[PDB]
Amino acid sequence: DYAPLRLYIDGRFHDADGRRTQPVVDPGTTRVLGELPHATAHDIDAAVQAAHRAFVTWRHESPLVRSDLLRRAAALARERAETIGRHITMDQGKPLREAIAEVVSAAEQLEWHAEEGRRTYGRVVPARSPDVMQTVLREPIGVCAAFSPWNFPFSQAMHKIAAALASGCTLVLKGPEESPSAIVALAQLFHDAGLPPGCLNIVWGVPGDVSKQLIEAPQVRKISFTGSVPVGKQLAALAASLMKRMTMELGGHAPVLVCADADVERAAAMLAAYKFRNAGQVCVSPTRFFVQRAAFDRFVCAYLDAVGTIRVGYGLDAGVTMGPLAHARRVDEIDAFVADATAKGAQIATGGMRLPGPGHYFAPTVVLGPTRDTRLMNDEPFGPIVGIVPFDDLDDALAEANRLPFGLASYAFTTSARNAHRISRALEAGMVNINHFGMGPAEIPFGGVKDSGFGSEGGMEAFDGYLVTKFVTQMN
Amino acid sequence: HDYAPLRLYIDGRFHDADGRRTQPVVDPGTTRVLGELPHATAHDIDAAVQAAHRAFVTWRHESPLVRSDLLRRAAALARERAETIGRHITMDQGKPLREAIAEVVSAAEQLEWHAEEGRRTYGRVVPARSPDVMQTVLREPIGVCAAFSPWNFPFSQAMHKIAAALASGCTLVLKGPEESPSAIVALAQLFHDAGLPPGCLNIVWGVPGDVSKQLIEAPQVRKISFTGSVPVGKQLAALAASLMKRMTMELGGHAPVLVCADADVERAAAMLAAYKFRNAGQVCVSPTRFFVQRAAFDRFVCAYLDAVGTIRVGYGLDAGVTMGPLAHARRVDEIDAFVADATAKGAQIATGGMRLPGPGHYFAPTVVLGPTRDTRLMNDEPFGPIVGIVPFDDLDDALAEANRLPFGLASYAFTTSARNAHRISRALEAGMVNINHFGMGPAEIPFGGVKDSGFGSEGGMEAFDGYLVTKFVTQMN
Amino acid sequence: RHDYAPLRLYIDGRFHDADGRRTQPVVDPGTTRVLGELPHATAHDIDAAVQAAHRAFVTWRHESPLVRSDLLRRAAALARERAETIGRHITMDQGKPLREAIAEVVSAAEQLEWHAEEGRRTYGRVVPARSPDVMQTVLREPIGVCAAFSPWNFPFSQAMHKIAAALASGCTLVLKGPEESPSAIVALAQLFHDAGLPPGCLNIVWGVPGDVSKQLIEAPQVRKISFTGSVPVGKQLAALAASLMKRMTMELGGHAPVLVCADADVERAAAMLAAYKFRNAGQVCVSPTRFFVQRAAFDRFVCAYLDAVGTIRVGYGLDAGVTMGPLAHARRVDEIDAFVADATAKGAQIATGGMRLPGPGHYFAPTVVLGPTRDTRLMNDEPFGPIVGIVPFDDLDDALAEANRLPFGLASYAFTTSARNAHRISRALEAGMVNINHFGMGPAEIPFGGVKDSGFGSEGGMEAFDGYLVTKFVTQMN
Amino acid sequence: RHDYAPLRLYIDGRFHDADGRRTQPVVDPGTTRVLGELPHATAHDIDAAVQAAHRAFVTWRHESPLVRSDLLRRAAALARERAETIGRHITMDQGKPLREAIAEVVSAAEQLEWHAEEGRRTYGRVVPARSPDVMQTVLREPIGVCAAFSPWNFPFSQAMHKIAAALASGCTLVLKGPEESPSAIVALAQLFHDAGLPPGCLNIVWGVPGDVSKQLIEAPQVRKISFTGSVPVGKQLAALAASLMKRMTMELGGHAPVLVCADADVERAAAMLAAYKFRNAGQVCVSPTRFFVQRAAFDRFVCAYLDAVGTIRVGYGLDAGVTMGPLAHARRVDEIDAFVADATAKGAQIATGGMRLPGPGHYFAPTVVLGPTRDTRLMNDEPFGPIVGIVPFDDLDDALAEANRLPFGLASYAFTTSARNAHRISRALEAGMVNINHFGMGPAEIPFGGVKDSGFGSEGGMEAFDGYLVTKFVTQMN
């Protein structure tokens, strides 16, 4: 009921024979699903060399031929969404419907990059002399190394693959060892779409060892990392020390500003359903809720009522809308957030404890009035917990929204043009969502500021980290 | 007397040393001391960062046309003061007066381009999937910047940092070159005289490693811009990245030149000789490795040596001098070592190759024939008045040799063939490819490198990329 | 005469007077005194202007964009230095208050400086090719000799648009400005002359407007037309230009709707809309004309609007304290009278104004008409004068439908605090420009233009050169 | 299968047979046999199509660009699936060899898919404001109902240009394709219908072309016209459109010059130019027509060109091995005869061809004319047929001046190994498209259009939507 786990190097799958493996466990049952083969150091060298060899011709392939191939892969992902999503549910925990939506979203991302790869436009700059021609070209940088995490194992990786391939680069990818089936399926569908050997390689191992070896590989010219801020800082320093380009999607700590003039009940119902998708294990998860005092009670009552409709359970079961957390350590982490909040006077309005059974189930948790020195209001919980505090002055709430070094997503609800304008300009965040959640579209750029990373994924900006600028000036 | 007072500039006020440590500034052509440069204290640098942050709060919101007017005023003053600023540059850096003045004028054009470009930091409206949704991609100034710029073009390298920071709506703490500082003082003076609000531009001095460490580690500093050597760039980039701070870098190059058999060979040789020995070859884009198609090799060399022979080495303020001394004694030692290494490995020194007489750091224009692939000259950036010229047979082999080094800033090619021009420009791994001329001057084009040569661009439309953050705003109405 | 500058033609770098030419009197609309005689170009003069523009274009198209910019910025600086003198003559031959004429010059200097900057940025595109030996470039190149026609309401800044756009794109220009308010155009020729613009790049001609425009449009060297004026004249000239496959851009009239939502700062909107409306006595292509005020705010808006209108001082444009001058000519006074009578005949109330003022000058009182019906001229035809109509509305979508009912579509205005109202109104309006809570069409860096009968193309902004550049696709296999 | 498909109108999502309407026979140009009867739209049919397109636009303009793209890509996939049948019918009613007809369908599918992608990217601009409380956006919005007219030379892909650009921009369309080769348009209606395109978005009509085009252009709801056809008809339609202030784009005739430099790969150029020239029997808007070959390469080029022309096989377009079919109609045979007669009467040499070929159909021999003078029709009028003129040149600047002498300016071609030649030629040519050493105007991602009499606006590329979008400047103070 769970697919075989493989490596994929230079157009060929590889199994465990002669390799170390690591068990893969279902977070909803704690049972072993399969064993994941680790790349050797030689495997990783072979993958870099194959990616370098593939890049020599792939960079020159027609952008339409490359588009055709990427679209064929996206079509296969859509055909296989139920099977791929089911394995994601098994090795990551999220409800099946969420896993399938992730596959579809990843297919749209891949298709957008196919379209955008035809549009890596250069610029002609009017010259000071009529015998001179000035062009600014954009060209693929070369072999890329990417590392992607477990919270959206299929779509996070698709970002790395879609951006590298559609820009004309090639890629060695180390996806999440703990939720690996999504990555194997990506290799499978790119293989089935006819992607030339070496263009896409997937490897596994001890993450620090794999990432160190990939970053120090001389043929690797650009790194892309999605993960935690402290690991991001370590890999970025190493990459920078070798003058290697990097783009980073790190954690966030999203503030929510609910103005007194908002549709308060509407905001509460939307934010409850959105918060507990993927059990809050979302880089953009709304976490710090600042609700104008006159609306606080109305919002909190509406929020708790909507949270009360959530059904926690095993992700393949009918009607389950929230699964377990990804591992036992996440349960302990939320426990510590809850304990820290209560010690400092906060009220646990609902949830706050683990749920019974084997497997890492935790109740959706709502914390009222957590102070500014609680962990909840400072450290990214990445889990099914929110803090809701009143505010009086909008500028004070904005200053609090900007106090943390995080700056990924942010949210606001208001009917006022002036409020919307002031909030959106004053927020220090890569993304500002007003009255809805609009970060899904592949055609918009997704990225952060401050500790939340560098660069963007999706949109027109998608290839910026993958292309070099070349100024060519010619006198005739 | 003939050299201006050297000062710090913090939060709109100039500071003399008043008890601070100083460092002598030496004229490289006479070795005489010109003046004393005051070092910023740790407290001075903190005050500059805090001043830049207070200034950023309002300057970020100032009208782009008001900011443009002010930056243009500063550029007009630079043009008015070009001779005086240029003379002092010759004195504390070495280059001939005509080059120093041309550097100032070029920096004024760069400043004006940025004034114009600051009005054009356009956002994007992305058509939404629903008619009640508005999707905008905004570009906003990142915040306080720290910049470090070197001595080879002390005025225009620094102007790049100032123009890009200020015109994007950021503010700046700048550490220019202690060994050639008058240009930086003049920059502070003219932005001050143009009425730039206090805190927007601050200039500091000190022990370079200590100052840069403090600036990068200052929490309010959000972005770094460095022009200098590759190893220092790698050290500072690693420090900045560990703090998740954005960086752009203009590092060294090792520019190859491909002279095809079908080129105007004599025209190429004369142009490349005059261009190479500008600033005594102390130029990040300086043509260094000459690959000349075998059949054109002898014709090119004779024409190159004839042109090299017309260069007049002397003191930069003296009439008719077209090459000055090197910037410091250590540069003479460095070129000596390149020459010795080439000779030991069998290369021919066609002209030059020795230091020139006199007090000051004078060195003869040096042309090395047939240096092998393991000579320092063909691997390490000499950044001085020396070239190597080797024959090639197959153009693709020459291109691989051009791309072999981790450097990738400038590159040059001379050909009349449309096919050669296309194949060369596509195959070169370089941020800039110059074909049949030297065209990296215009403020409206992007200047930058690949691989070890750095990342990001200065000038052109790309000038603000490191200074703006992307903000996606999506609103349901 | 003594306080008014000499009127001249300007052809191939030389000024020409009336020797051998027919002339036309130039009249001060505030006094009816004759200011001077305007020389008419002969047919041969116009031929010479077109030939000179063509010879100039041959080299001007290849001049460095930075050299062209330097020159254009010098001309702009001269405009700033001469603003008081140029403005005084504009007031004399056009009628508007001195402060308005000087502000017009300063605005035109900014527009010209913007085009100097934008001329360096007529970027082409490199399109990634299907084969690595192919190079695909999309170039933008100047189209050639342009002919332009600009009106009297902003004689200096409307003409500046034609000159700045043509010159900064690499084109050259034969311009026919307004014979009724001509000194601004002569001053434009003088400052481009003084800045060193090469001969032939800019030529100014005068004459019988229909005859001059016919000859210019039919000149084979002329490749592109640009016209600002009335819709019916634009349609005649556009049809002639199109019959010869010549490119055109057009800035025609508008009939601007204003939507005042109930949640607006009503008093602020009324005060702003009153001062803005009667600038240049409403002789403004974007002039707010049809005011749709949500019923609950109607009385409050009207009371504040009438109060603000009451502070306007009508008089001669050079006199201290005058904030509205006379209309441009006697036929304008007759036209506004006919609007007033037509509204009165159909049941509307004249809340203030509604009559002509004494004196030989073409003075008319600022006029506010309440409740004019859908079949009044005021709610259908562009009045281009000191008159507005104000009606209540209940449902915003009905107001939007009325705002869109006319074939005009230049400017439009709205006042609201609601994000939804602002979004719904801005998307639903059929207009080239939507101003919400303020009047923001001034900046040189934004595109100014209309839809439907109000024309096509834009002036200013990134779009300024679109009508002046041709696309050239170059594809090369190596 | 030798069947020919039913010819129908398509209005508001439903097909119509003739049902007593006037009809017109459709004739196979290779056999002269009647293939079927084409129904003409009545005036009421045309009114209904305009009204249906207007209703449809109300919701189509607000549809998600991704939903619209999905639908257009489904239509493209159906075109690819049906390519053999659609292509066979094109050969039957237009004449071109089957392999050309199929390639036209595939090329049109690529054009449709590109527009699907580009419709997601009709980006607006945010202009940095002078005050922090102001928001300035430049939006691009679909103009409304479009009317389009497309010709017979590429009946499927010319019409696809009109359909793809209108629909993908958010507009709707009433299309009048070529009555003489109508099956391709019916096939287009069928596949957009089969893809689920909402009713009214695409309507196809037929009739007397001047009457249909007059009625569509004068329909009030029609806001924009797009025409591909001849220069004189384009000028007639453009003047009518301009008189009503309606936006227009035009792809008219060309007269392509070819500059063959002495340093070219001459034999490669001759062989490529021969095969490209006689595609669609030269009935191509970009067809290479005037060949200027540097004197030193002239003999080599002509000899190699004649050899390649000699390999062309003329016959019925469905027959095996045929590489050129008949001309589209008898009137084309008369026209080419007149070009040949004028050339010989003025002293040129007919090196090959020059006569009609046997049989009932409009077959004509590939014709190469040597040394036609500047006063021959061949060097001045677009022949649009299987004929070229070849003259030597000595000075490259004189060849460029001759290449630019005509008011035509669509495509142009050059062959050289010199970077200087390529640069000087590509900059000096007055043409919308310059092809150097190959023919590179096929890609959907590049802009296709002309200058001077050859039209204005572009199809394909990023520019594809420029005629279909209005600019809206929104400035909001908060």
Q: What 3-state class would DSSP assign to A8?
A: strand
Q: Which residues contact B419 (CB under 8 A, 6 or more apart)?
A: C478, D417
Given a contact cutoff of 8 angstroms between Cβ atoms, the answer to whether C415 and C437 are in contact is: yes
Residues of D in contact with C252 (CB under 8 A): 245
Q: What one-character DSSP code corresponds to residue D284?
A: -
Residues of A in contact with C123 (CB under 8 A): 123-126
- Could you say which of A249, A333, A380, A457 is catalytic? A249
- The CATH number that applies at residue D288 is 3.40.309.10
Q: What one-character DSSP code corresponds to residue D198?
A: P
Give me the residue from A64, A420, A443 closest to D120, CB to CB: A443
Inter-chain residue contact B123 with D122, CB threshold 8 Å? no
The residue in chain A having the minimum alpha-carbon distance to the alpha carbon of residue C170 is A126
Give me the residue from D110, D117, D427 closest to A115, CB to CB: D117
Distances, alpha carbon A412 to alpha carbons A231, A280, A394, A404, B178, in Å: 30, 18, 11, 17, 49
User: How many CB pairs below 8 A link B and D?
Assistant: 60
Residues of D in contact with B121 (CB under 8 A): 128
The crossing angle, in degrees rounded to 10, of helices B294-308 and B265-276 is: 50
Give me the residue from A119, A133, A460 closest to D423, CB to CB: A133
CA distance B322 to chain D (A): 32
Where is B164: in which H helix or E strand? helix B154-167
Residues of B in contact with C423 (CB under 8 A): 132, 134, 475, 477
The crossing angle, in degrees rounded to 10, of helices D98-118 and D155-168 is: 10
d(C-alpha C385, C-alpha C295), whole Å: 26
Per DSSP, which regions of D114-186 are E strands?
Answer: 124-126, 134-142, 145-149, 172-176
CA atoms within 13 A on the CB side of A66: 32
d(C-alpha A270, C-alpha A413), whole Å: 11
CA distance A115 to chain D (A): 6
The residue count for chain B: 477
Q: What 3-state class would DSSP assign to C129?
A: coil
Q: List the structure tokens of B28.
A: 């490289």
* CA gyration radius, chain D: 23
d(C-alpha A139, C-alpha D169), whole Å: 30
Residues of C in contact with A416 (CB under 8 A): 417-419
Give me the residue from B242, B428, B437 closest to A237, CB to CB: B242
d(C-alpha D276, C-alpha D270), whole Å: 10
The residue count for chain D: 478
Burial (CB count <10 Å: 0-12, 13-18, 19+), residue B344: exposed
User: How many CB pairs below 8 A link A and B?
Assistant: 175
Q: List the structure tokens of B177.
A: 């070159």
d(C-alpha A311, C-alpha A313), whole Å: 7
Inter-chain residue contact C132 with B418, CB threshold 8 Å? no
Phi/psi for B26 (5° steps) reads: -115, 140
d(C-alpha C193, C-alpha C189), whole Å: 6
Give me the residue from B64, B126, B418 closest to D422, CB to CB: B418
Inter-chain residue contact B445 with A232, CB threshold 8 Å? no
Distances, alpha carbon B111 to alpha carbons B106, B159, B432, in Å: 9, 7, 21
CA proximity to A147, closest of A171, A170, A175, A172: A175
Inter-chain residue contact D135 with A418, CB threshold 8 Å? no
C356: left (phi over 0), alpha (psi -120 to 50) or beta: beta
Phi/psi for B428 (5° steps) reads: -65, 135
Inter-chain residue contact C133 with B418, CB threshold 8 Å? no
Tell me if residue C201 is catalytic: no
Residue in D66, D110, D137, D426 to test binding to A, most A beta-carbons within 10 Å: D66
Domain co-membership, D347 together with D451? no
CA proximity to A123, closest of C472, B462, B427: B462
Given a contact cutoff of 8 angstroms between Cβ atoms, the answer to whether D29 and D208 are in contact is: no
Domain co-membership, D412 together with D280? yes
Inter-chain residue contact B137 with A444, CB threshold 8 Å? yes
Q: What 3-state class would DSSP assign to D140?
A: strand
Given a contact cutoff of 8 angstroms between Cβ atoms, the answer to whether A164 and A171 are in contact is: yes
d(C-alpha B382, C-alpha B288), whole Å: 8
Phi/psi for D331 (5° steps) reads: -60, -30
Q: What 3-state class would DSSP assign to A126?
A: coil
Residues of C in contact with D458 (CB under 8 A): 471
The number of beta carbons lying within 10 Å of the beta carbon of residue A394 is 20
Domain co-membership, D201 together with D265? no
Residues of D in contact with A417 (CB under 8 A): 476, 478
CA torsion D66-D70-D72-D78 (nearest 10°) is 170
CA proximity to B219, closest of B46, B414, B417: B46
Domain co-membership, C80 together with C119? yes
Inter-chain residue contact A476 with D133, CB threshold 8 Å? no
Inter-chain residue contact C135 with B422, CB threshold 8 Å? yes
Q: List the structure tokens of B59.
A: 């300057």
Give me the residue from B123, B124, B419 closest to D417, CB to CB: B419
Q: What one-character DSSP code corresponds to residue C372?
A: -
Residue in C68, C123, C423 to test binding to B, most B beta-carbons within 10 Å: C423
CA proximity to D362, closest of D99, D94, D43: D94
d(C-alpha A398, C-alpha A410), whole Å: 11
CA D177, chain centre distance (Å): 12
CA proximity to C67, closest of C174, C201, C173, C161: C201
Domain co-membership, D174 together with D35? yes
Phi/psi for B119 (5° steps) reads: -80, -5
Domain co-membership, A362 together with A243? no
Residues of D in contact with B415 (CB under 8 A): 419
Give me the residue from C120, C420, C424 closest to B444, CB to CB: C120
Question: Hey, which residues of D are catalytic here?
Answer: 251, 285
Distances, alpha carbon B289 to alpha carbons A381, B197, B367, in Å: 55, 46, 11
CB < 8 Å & 24+ apart, contacts of D234-240: D234/C245, D234/D455, D235/C242, D235/C243, D235/C244, D235/C245, D236/C243, D237/D149, D237/D213, D238/C242, D238/C243, D238/C245, D239/C239, D239/C240, D239/C242, D239/C243, D240/C239, D240/D214
d(C-alpha D444, C-alpha A63), whole Å: 12
Where is C310: in which H helix or E strand? helix C295-310
Residues forming beta bridges with residue B250, ordered by sequence position: B227, B454
Distances, alpha carbon D3 to alpha carbons D24, D38, D86, in Å: 18, 15, 12
Domain co-membership, A122 together with A59? yes
CA distance A437 to chain B (A): 8
CA proximity to A157, closest of A199, A102, A208: A102
CA proximity to C415, closest of C326, C319, C297, C303: C297
Inter-chain residue contact B432 with A239, CB threshold 8 Å? no
CA distance B195 to chain C (A): 20
Neighbours of chain A (3+ CB pairs under 8 A): B, C, D
Inter-chain residue contact A130 with D427, CB threshold 8 Å? yes
CA distance D187 to chain A (A): 25
Alpha helices in A11-123 (DSSP H): 41-58, 63-79, 81-92, 96-116
Give me the residue from D66, D445, D478 closest to A118, CB to CB: D445
The number of beta carbons lying within 10 Å of the beta carbon of residue D222 is 21
CA distance B393 to chain A (A): 23
CA distance C6 to chain D (A): 38
Q: How many domains does chain A have?
A: 2
CA proximity to C474, closest of D258, D426, D461: D426
The residue in chain B having the minimum alpha-carbon distance to the alpha carbon of residue C123 is B461
- The CATH number that applies at residue C131 is 3.40.605.10
CA C203, chain centre distance (Å): 20
Domain co-membership, B424 together with B473? no
Q: Which residues of B touch D (CB under 8 A)?
A: 61, 63-66, 119-127, 129-131, 136-138, 415-419, 421
Per DSSP, which regions of D210-348 are E strands?
Answer: 222-228, 247-251, 256-260, 288-294
Domain co-membership, D198 together with D71? yes
Given a contact cutoff of 8 angstroms between Cβ atoms, the answer to whether C365 and C306 are in contact is: no
Q: Which amino acid is at B460?
A: G
Q: Which amino acid is at A149?
A: P
Tell me if residue C251 is catalytic: yes
How does DSSP assign B38-97, residue by residue? EPPPHHHHHHHHHHHHHHHHHHTTS-HHHHHHHHHHHHHHHHHTHHHHHHHHHHHH---H
Residues of A in contact with D420 (CB under 8 A): 476
In which domain, by residue range, is A403 found? 252-441
CA distance A402 to chain B (A): 13
Q: Which residues contact D197 (CB under 8 A, 6 or more apart)?
A: D13, D71, D75, D167
Residues of C in contact with A64 (CB under 8 A): 130
Domain co-membership, D348 together with D476? no
Domain co-membership, A344 together with A454? no
* CA gyration radius, chain A: 23
d(C-alpha A272, C-alpha A280), whole Å: 10
Residue in B444, B462, B477 to test binding to C, most C beta-carbons within 10 Å: B477
- Could you say which of C100, C251, C335, C430 is catalytic? C251
Domain co-membership, D212 together with D340? no
**CA torsion sign, A38 to A43 to A48 to A50?**
negative
Residues forming beta bridges with residue D149, ordered by sequence position: D176, D227
Gap between the terminal Cα atoms of chain A: 66
d(C-alpha B395, C-alpha B366), whole Å: 26
CA atoms within 13 A on the CB side of D221: 18
Q: What 3-state class would DSSP assign to A243?
A: coil
d(C-alpha D150, C-alpha C373), whole Å: 44
CA D389, chain centre distance (Å): 23
Given a contact cutoff of 8 angstroms between Cβ atoms, the answer to whether C249 and C282 are in contact is: no
